[PDB]
């Protein structure tokens, strides 16, 4: 359990952790940004309902969908 | 000198992309790896369900005959 700051590499096949661990050595700070990038899209796969989900754009419009009260 | 449109940088959180671009200059190949990583996890959203090819569906229904019993 003697590690400075590792965990992302322990969340995927050894084949990937090998090619990554070798390149990361050069950019231990760059891989940090991408680490959050891949996670961003990961959660995007599932989004609960809080206050109307926006994403699907439409060419023609008519109204603001069903909205009578709150 | 202002680039002609961009992908996977202008859409996503441009706030972070700002620091990524400067880093990408150093590791133009490394980013290529993380690019496939984020896309890989995306497809992972699915699983290898179905065991018996789907058919049975019982939860709280044990025998419901009447005419025949013996």
Curated annotation (Swiss-Prot), chains A, B:
When this gene is knocked out, what is seen?
Decreases nucleosomal density. Increases HTA1 RNA level; simultaneous disruption RTT109 alleviates the effect.
Region Dimeric region: start and end of each range?
Answer: 5-70
Localization recorded for this chain is: Nucleus; Chromosome
Q: Which residues carry this modification: N-acetylserine?
A: 5
Q: Which family does it belong to?
A: Belongs to the RTT106 family.
Copy the domain comment: The N-ter domain (residues 1-67) homodimerizes and interacts with H3-H4 independently of acetylation while the double pleckstrin-homology (PH) domain (residues 68-301) binds the 'Lys-56'-containing region of H3.
Physiological role: Histones H3 and H4 chaperone involved in the nucleosome formation and heterochromatin silencing. Required for the deposition of H3K56ac-carrying H3-H4 complex onto newly-replicated DNA. Plays a role in the transcriptional regulation of the cell-cycle dependent histone genes by directly recruiting the SWI/SNF and RSC chromatin remodeling complexes to the histone genes in a cell cycle dependent manner. In cooperation with HIR and ASF1, creates a repressive structure at the core histone gene promoter and contributes to their repression outside of S phase.
Q: How does it assemble?
A: Homodimers (via the N-terminal domain). Interacts with the SWI/SNF complex. Interacts with the RSC complex. Interacts with the HIR complex. Interacts with the CAF-1 complex. Interacts with RLF2. Interacts with SIR4. Interacts with YTA7. Interacts with CAC2. Interacts with HPC2. Interacts with HIR2. Interacts with MSI1. Interacts with HIR1. Interacts with histone H3. Interacts with histone H4.
Q: Quote the record's miscellaneous comment.
A: Present with 11100 molecules/cell in log phase SD medium.
Which protein is depicted?
A: Histone chaperone RTT106
- List the source organism: Saccharomyces cerevisiae (strain ATCC 204508 / S288c) (Baker's yeast)
Q: Which residues of the full protein are shown?
A: 1 to 67 of 455
